[PDB]
Structures are given as structure tokens and as C-alpha cells.
Amino acid sequence: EFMVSLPRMVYPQPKVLTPCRKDVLVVTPWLAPIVWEGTFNIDILNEQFRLQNTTIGLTVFAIKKYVAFLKLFLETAEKHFMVGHRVHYYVFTDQPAAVPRVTLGTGRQLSVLEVGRRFLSEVDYLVCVDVDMEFRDHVGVEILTPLFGTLHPSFYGSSREAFTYERRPQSQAYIPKDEGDFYYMGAFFGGSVQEVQRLTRACHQAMMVDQANGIEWHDCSHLNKYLLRHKPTKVLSPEYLWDQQLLGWPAVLRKLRFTAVP
Ligand SMILES: [Hg+2]
Ligand SMILES: [Hg+2]
Ligand SMILES: [Hg+2]
Ligand SMILES: [Hg+2]
Ligand SMILES: [Hg+2]
Numbered sequence: 001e002f003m004v005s006l007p008r009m010v011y012p013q014p015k016v017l018t019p020c021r022k023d024v025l026v027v028t029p030w031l032a033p034i035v036w037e038g039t040f041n042i043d044i045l046n047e048q049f050r051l052q053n054t055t056i057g058l059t060v061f062a063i064k065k066y067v068a069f070l071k072l073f074l075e076t077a078e079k080h081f082m083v084g085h086r087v088h089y090y091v092f093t094d095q096p097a098a099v100p101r102v103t104l105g106t107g108r109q110l111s112v113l114e115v116g117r118r119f120l121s122e123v124d125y126l127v128c129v130d131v132d133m134e135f136r137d138h139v140g141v142e143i144l145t146p147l148f149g150t151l152h153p154s155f156y157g158s159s160r161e162a163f164t165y166e167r168r169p170q171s172q173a174y175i176p177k178d179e180g181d182f183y184y185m186g187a188f189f190g191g192s193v194q195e196v197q198r199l200t201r202a203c204h205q206a207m208m209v210d211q212a213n214g215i216e217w218h219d220c221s222h223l224n225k226y227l228l229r230h231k232p233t234k235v236l237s238p239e240y241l242w243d244q245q246l247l248g249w250p251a252v253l254r255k256l257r258f259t260a261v262p
Pocket of ligand 5: 199200203219222223226
């Protein structure tokens with residue numbers, strides 16, 4: 001779409017001969033940024049996305065006992081997720097009446113969809129996350145792109161042969177030992193509505209094929225196969241999907257933004 005000029009802004013000059021980070025990879029081999037603290041100026045990005053009147057959809061499934069995680073999830077999203085931008089939460093649940101009444105900031109809305117094209121007209125981007133989580137620091141427009149995945153926090157330092165991809169050749173999710181860029185976790189992915197729908201359609205079909213052939217990480221295996229074959233346009237660092245009880249707070253993580261609930 002047509003993009004208006006940015007206003008005058010005052011910020012430190014980028015330093016061509018100073019790397020952002022010397023401890024981590026900040027760009028994939030297909031030139032997608034890998035999003036770590038210290039790589040982005042959020043004021044620039046906020047301007048760019050507000051000038052497009054960007055709306056972000058946040059989708060969460062909360063079935064059976066998982067409804068209990070909604071209150072903390074939504075309260076913390078209010079403090080940390082896309083603050084200043086238009087947000088539409090979509091809570092898919094078998095217990096609509098048990099969704100807690102959480103107070104939202106202006107320009108933010110929540111829809112409860114009961115489970116046993118709306119997204120295209122309502123939001124620009126869709127972000128798909130697990131509900132048994134809390135935001136502890138900024139998660140903002142720096143993630144937005146046509147298609148993103150997030151590095152699994154248990155495997156970011158692992159060699160690809162150790163990745164727990166699907167290794168049975170009979171599965172549609174099969175990845176051999178000599179293939180793989182990263183191990184992505186399904187607990188946080190997203191993109192444009194069109195790209196997220198492409199992904200979820202592909203995954204659903206591959207899973208149907210495997211079921212027909214008698215074969216069943218499941219969600220993570222199919223995601224990982226899709227993102228191998230359709231490279232994400234941004235990758236989120238493990239700042240964006242962490243478990244402090246399991247993994248601590250290593251020096252490489254400057255912020256812990258979205259985490260497991262103890
Ligand atoms: Hg930098
Ligand atoms: Hg989704
Ligand atoms: Hg989702
Ligand atoms: Hg897939
Ligand atoms: Hg998937």
C-alpha cells in the first residue's frame with residue numbers, strides 16, 4: 001500500500017563499522033532479520049506501523065483447564081503486547097462464560113469464539129500463541145512481517161542432527177539429518193493473514209495425509225517442515241519464547257519477553 005513519509009526524528013546514527021551484536025546471528029542466510037534486543041529502534045518501527053494504521057490479531061486457544069491461564073495472559077498482553085497499536089484478541093474456547101473480564105486499553109478488543117475470511121477483513125497480521133504463558137517485557141511491531149517463526153528455547157544452540165524434527169521418511173513432516181535451518185516452536189508464530197492461512201492450510205493437509213497413512217512433536221513437526229520449505233521473512237530469538245524455570249536467564253538474552261507460567 002501507499003506509505004506516507006516519516007516525520008523528522010532524532011536518534012543515534014547507525015554505525016556501519018560496529019556490529020549490533022557480536023554474540024549472536026542477526027540475519028538468516030536468506031536475509032531475514034533475526035530479532036534480538038539491540039537490533040531495532042522501536043521508535044522508527046512504531047512510526048512505520050502506525051502510519052499504516054496496523055491492526056494485529058492475537059489468537060489463543062483455551063480449552064478445558066487452560067481457561068484458567070486467560071486472566072494472566074490477557075492482563076500481561078495489555079501491558080506488553082503491541083501497546084499503542086490496534087489489537088484484536090481472538091479467544092477460541094469451549095467455555096465462553098469462563099473467559100475472564102479483563103480491562104482493555106483503548107483501541108483494543110476481544111472476541112470470544114466458541115469451539116465444539118473474518119480475519120482478512122479485520123486484521124492485517126495474525127499472531128498465534130499458546131495461552132499458558134505471560135508477557136514480561138515488550139513484544140511489539142518489530143516482529144511483524146509476512147511470515148515469522150520463533151526459535152525453540154531448548155534448541156537454539158543445537159546442531160541440526162539433534163533437532164527433534166520428524167525423522168520417519170513416511171511422514172509428510174520428514175526432515176533428514178542433513179537438512180534444517182532452525183528448530184522453531186509452535187507456541188509463537190505469525191505473519192500476514194494470507195501467510196498464516198497458507199501455513200495452517202498446508203499443515204492441516206499434511207497431517208490428514210499422515211493420518212491416512214497411519215502415522216502421527218506433531219504440531220511442531222509440521223510447522224518445522226513448512227518453515228524449512230517456505231522460509232520465514234523474520235525469525236524471533238528466544239527472548240520471545242522462554243522458560244526461566246527450565247532454562248534460567250543466560251547472558252545472550254537481554255530481555256525475557258514472553259515466558260512459560262511456573
Ligand atoms: Hg545495532
Ligand atoms: Hg492463528
Ligand atoms: Hg492460535
Ligand atoms: Hg506444514
Ligand atoms: Hg503448523
